[PDB]
Amino acid sequence: KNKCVNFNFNGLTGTGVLTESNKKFLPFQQFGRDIADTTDAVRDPQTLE
Amino acid sequence: IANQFNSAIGKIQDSLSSTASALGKLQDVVNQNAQALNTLVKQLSSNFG
Ligand SMILES: *[C@@H]1O[C@H](CO)[C@@H](O[C@@H]2O[C@H](CO)[C@@H](O)[C@H](O)[C@H]2NC(C)=O)[C@H](O)[C@H]1NC(C)=O
């Protein structure tokens, strides 16, 4: 977290900076999207934050 | 003539204080440049086939 990285979450490859969100995802969702349809939030698959 | 100018400037304050649409010429120019960037951002969400 708080560093630029080449992430991959469940095959969602990309590049970015990861920080702890305060967005509250309902159980059925792994990803949040932007106006541009790019992912801008994600739920980590091992610790579900 | 001084009283009429002083009274007419007092109406400029009251008008600008009261009505919403008067500066519409400037706000329309902000709203076009913002709508054009927002349309350009939404067009990233398109598949194009
Ligand atoms: C990933 O691993 C962790 C354990 O390493 C699993 O989470 C555990 O879940 C149980 C039940 O809630 C807790 O008692 C443990 O405290 C949790 N683990 C840790 C490390 O605290 C998790 O289930 C695993 N991932 C998946 C998808 O099952």
Side-chain angles (χ1 to χ4, degrees), chain A residues 35-37, chain B residues 42 44-45:
Chain A
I35 308 303
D37 215 12
Chain B
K42 282 184 296 196
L44 290 167
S45 74

Side-chain angles (χ1 to χ4, degrees), chain B:
Chain B
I1 292 161
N3 289 350
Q4 291 206 55
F5 174 75
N6 294 342
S7 179
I9 289 289
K11 279 180 269 294
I12 302 305
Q13 299 188 158
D14 295 356
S15 181
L16 295 178
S17 179
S18 305
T19 180
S21 61
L23 277 80
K25 280 183 176 64
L26 301 182
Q27 192 69 77
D28 187 16
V29 171
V30 178
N31 290 358
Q32 285 164 86
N33 284 276
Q35 177 182 250
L37 279 164
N38 289 333
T39 298
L40 182 71
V41 172
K42 282 184 296 196
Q43 282 186 27
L44 290 167
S45 74
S46 294
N47 277 64
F48 304 110

